[PDB]
Amino acid sequence: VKDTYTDRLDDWNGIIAGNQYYDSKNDQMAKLNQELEGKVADSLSSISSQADRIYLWEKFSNYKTSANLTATYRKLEEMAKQVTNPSSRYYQDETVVRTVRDSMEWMHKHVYNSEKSIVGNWWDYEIGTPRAINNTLSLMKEYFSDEEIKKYTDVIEKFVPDPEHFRKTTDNPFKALGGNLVDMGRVKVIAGLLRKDDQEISSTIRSIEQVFKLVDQGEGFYQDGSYIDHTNVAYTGAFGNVLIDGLSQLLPVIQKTKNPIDKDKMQTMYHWIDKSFAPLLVNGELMDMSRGRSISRANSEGHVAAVEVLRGIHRIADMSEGETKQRLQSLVKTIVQSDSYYDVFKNLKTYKDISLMQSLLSDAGVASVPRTSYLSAFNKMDKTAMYNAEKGFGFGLSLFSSRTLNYEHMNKENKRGWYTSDGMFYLYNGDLSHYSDGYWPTVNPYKMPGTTETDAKRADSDTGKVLPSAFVGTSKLDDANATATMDFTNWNQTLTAHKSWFMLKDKIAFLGSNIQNTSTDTAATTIDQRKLESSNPYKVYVNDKEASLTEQEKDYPETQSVFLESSDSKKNIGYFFFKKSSISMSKALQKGAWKDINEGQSDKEVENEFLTISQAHKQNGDSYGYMLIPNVDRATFNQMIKELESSLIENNETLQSVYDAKQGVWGIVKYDDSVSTISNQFQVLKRGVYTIRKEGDEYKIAYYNPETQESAPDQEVFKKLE
Numbered sequence: 196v197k198d199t200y201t202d203r204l205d206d207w208n209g210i211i212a213g214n215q216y217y218d219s220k221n222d223q224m225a226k227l228n229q230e231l232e233g234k235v236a237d238s239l240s241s242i243s244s245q246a247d248r249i250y251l252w253e254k255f256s257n258y259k260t261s262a263n264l265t266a267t268y269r270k271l272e273e274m275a276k277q278v279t280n281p282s283s284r285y286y287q288d289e290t291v292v293r294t295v296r297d298s299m300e301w302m303h304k305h306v307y308n309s310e311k312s313i314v315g316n317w318w319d320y321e322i323g324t325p326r327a328i329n330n331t332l333s334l335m336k337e338y339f340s341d342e343e344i345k346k347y348t349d350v351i352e353k354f355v356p357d358p359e360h361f362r363k364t365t366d367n368p369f370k371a372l373g374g375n376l377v378d379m380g381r382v383k384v385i386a387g388l389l390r391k392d393d394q395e396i397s398s399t400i401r402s403i404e405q406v407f408k409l410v411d412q413g414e415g416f417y418q419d420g421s422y423i424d425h426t427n428v429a430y431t432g433a434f435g436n437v438l439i440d441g442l443s444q445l446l447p448v449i450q451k452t453k454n455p456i457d458k459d460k461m462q463t464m465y466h467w468i469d470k471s472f473a474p475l476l477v478n479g480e481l482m483d484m485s486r487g488r489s490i491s492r493a494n495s496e497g498h499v500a501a502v503e504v505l506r507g508i509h510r511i512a513d514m515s516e517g518e519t520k521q522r523l524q525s526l527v528k529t530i531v532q533s534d535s536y537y538d539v540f541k542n543l544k545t546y547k548d549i550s551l552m553q554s555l556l557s558d559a560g561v562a563s564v565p566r567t568s569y570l571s572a573f574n575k576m577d578k579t580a581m582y583n584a585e586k587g588f589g590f591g592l593s594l595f596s597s598r599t600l601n602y603e604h605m606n607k608e609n610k611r612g613w614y615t616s617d618g619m620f621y622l623y624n625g626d627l628s629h630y631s632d633g634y635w636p637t638v639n640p641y642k643m644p645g646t647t648e649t650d651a652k653r654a655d656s657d658t659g660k661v662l663p664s665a666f667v668g669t670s671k672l673d674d675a676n677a678t679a680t681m682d683f684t685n686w687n688q689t690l691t692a693h694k695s696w697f698m699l700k701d702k703i704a705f706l707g708s709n710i711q712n713t714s715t716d717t718a719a720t721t722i723d724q725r726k727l728e729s730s731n732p733y734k735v736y737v738n739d740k741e742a743s744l745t746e747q748e749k750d751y752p753e754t755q756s757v758f759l760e761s762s763d764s765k766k767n768i769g770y771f772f773f774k775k776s777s778i779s780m781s782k783a784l785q786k787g788a789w790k791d792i793n794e795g796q797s798d799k800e801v802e803n804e805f806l807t808i809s810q811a812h813k814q815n816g817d818s819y820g821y822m823l824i825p826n827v828d829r830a831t832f833n834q835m836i837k838e839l840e841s842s843l844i845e846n847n848e849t850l851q852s853v854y855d856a857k858q859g860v861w862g863i864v865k866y867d868d869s870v871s872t873i874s875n876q877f878q879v880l881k882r883g884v885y886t887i888r889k890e891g892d893e894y895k896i897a898y899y900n901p902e903t904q905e906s907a908p909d910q911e912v913f914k915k916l917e
């Protein structure tokens with residue numbers, strides 16, 4: 196029956212499909228249409244049309260595997276999209292209409308109904324499938340009777356009767372928050388509209404409002420921009436994605452119901468965009484350190500995942516007004532235009548999203564200016580993101596502590612992310628494809644960049660752990676300078692190391708001390724493991740002399756520097772060792788398959804060439820110290836290292852500090868409360884992390900106590916000399 200409920204469903208259809216906006220003369224839209232035409236064609240030709248069939252699609256036949264239910268229903272949603280698209284060859288097709296109706300009834304009688312119980316993954320029974328069913332019925336509401344709609348959505352009410360919890364029919368339900376809570380809306384708000392149930396709509400929207408509250412503990416968005424999910428996992432880039440992507444779709448509909456959400460409540464979304472998401476986007480790529488186990492999905496590499504966030508932001512801009520709308524448009528526009536590697540349209544899956552992006556990109560009134568430098572210390576999730584606009588590089592520091600899990604391996608995904616938070620670092624430079632094109636299945640998991648580990652064999656069946664210490668954190672001085680430390684102990688408590696980082700505008704110093712090993716395994720720090728481009732080969736220099744790397748590891752004793760020279764200076768990487776160090780390097784082709792790190796992925800062999808740099812630690816009390824200097828040419832790098840000749844202030848078991856004389860900035864990490872005199876100019880007095888700048892006779896102080904997660908009055912931690 197056509198009423199206010201169907202009106203809302205019409206709006207929903209315009210959002211999840213947007214057939215009303217389709218234009219055959221629009222190349223990008225025609226491309227998506229062609230993709231849907233092909234998917235429906237394949238589904239129609241491979242579907243079982245035999246009496247007493249045991250499945251609809253042979254490749255999604257084992258229904259004890261919950262994933263097969265969602266995949267099946269999604270094929271029907273695709274049919275619904277095309278049967279209602281005037282330009283599709285399947286528009287109002289009698290066979291497709293009957294195929295959707297008959298398939299819904301078949302699955303309802305033999306696979307998914309109220310008399311069934313969760314078998315496999317609860318997510319498919321409560322989120323994946325219900326969403327696919329809601330969308331199918333919404334799109335084809337003019338072909339189904341209200342009784343049929345209520346009949347096919349009864350199963351949804353059986354598995355998801357409570358808008359505040361998931362796994363309600365199990366022996367361990369949980370409180371819905373974040374991304375999951377948003378999906379709760381895409382399940383019950385739409386189901387409510389389809390069933391014309393006001394109580395379901397109102398109660399669900401009320402539950403959804405919890406999402407706008409910032410938290411100071413547990414799962415959710417924090418004031419400092421961090422986002423935690425799954426109890427204690429940094430997750431802005433995966434579950435946070437689902438949250439903004441799904442919520443931006445729902446809001447236009449929710450705001451037109453009899454239960455619209457207060458404007459002041461939704462105000463926090465802008466905080467998420469500017470504080471949480473924006474910093475994690477560099478040249479169109481969403482930083483992997485925020486994506487949890489999703490890094491192990493071949494169809495979701497960094498640039499693809501970023502689009503989930505960007506399309507969400509764009510929709511929010513569209514529903515905003517004035518300056519707010521204008522600036523959000525500019526944010527999306529500059530990020531998209533800075534991405535010369537990935538075509539944003541490859542992940543805009545509805546006509547309205549495509550249309551919005553096209554108008555934005557062609558609107559001269561919307562400014563597209565390169566983003567400025569920034570540095571975000573996401574202490575509540577132990578990650579740090581840095582971006583230098585002058586030189587054009589981004590830097591990500593991935594840590595964990597007693598407050599956070601190191602890596603997530605679940606649902607057979609991310610089987611080898613063991614060391615992705617053991618002080619792993621990311622460098623975002625001119626090669627926008629670096630962490631893409633098969634990086635994850637080919638990178639050697641035992642040598643993640645920046646990590647100090649023993650060479651012990653690790654099991655794919657292992658799961659994450661928290662760190663014994665709470666002494667992990669970042670002290671930020673300004674948009675270009677910060678200092679971080681991690682009181683590191685490895686997975687089996689056989690190795691320790693005081694690892695610290697000194698972000699000094701256009702370079703990052705890496706210092707490690709107190710390196711100890713009680714095992715029979717060899718210990719070493721991976722200085723880098725960089726994925727190469729066959730098109731842009733690097734010329735390697737050691738102590739400014741060209742070196743020829745081989746698949747076989749070569750030792751370079753008394754190394755003062757290593758320089759990776761590209762034809763594009765924006766891809767150059769230099770490493771300056773404060774004190775001559777003994778390192779080893781190799782360049783080799785590494786093969787692997789996505790299935791190796793994610794059971795549900797393809798076993799197809801992938802291969803990439805990597806340049807690995809390592810420093811062995813054969814004695815207790817060992818240390819390492821070097822400066823990473825990106826994006827400068829060879830002559831400039833050589834000049835800079837001479838300027839940094841005496842930049843290392845100290846690197847021992849209680850004090851680590853680097854000084855940038857050009858800036859007049861000091862980075863300092865203290866592991867005890869002894870009085871530390873620095874550069875015969877001032878003293879720092881407390882265990883913690885510091886970033887200090889001298890501006891003649893004045894001193895700006897940034898102190899952070901990572902264990903208590905508090906700063907402190909200047910006189911408690913700093914004292915100028917004389």
Ligand SMILES: CC(=O)N[C@@H]1[C@@H](O[C@@H]2OC(C(=O)O)=C[C@H](O)[C@H]2O)[C@@H](O)[C@@H](COS(=O)(=O)O)O[C@H]1O
Pocket residue numbers: 262316318319323374433434437489503606795
């Ligand atoms: C955040 C996350 O990893 N969520 C998991 C699901 O993944 C998301 O799926 C969708 C969607 O619209 O369904 C959008 C996102 O890009 C993607 O991250 C999914 O993996 C389900 C079920 O698993 S599966 O059978 O392995 O595919 O589990 C969620 O936790």
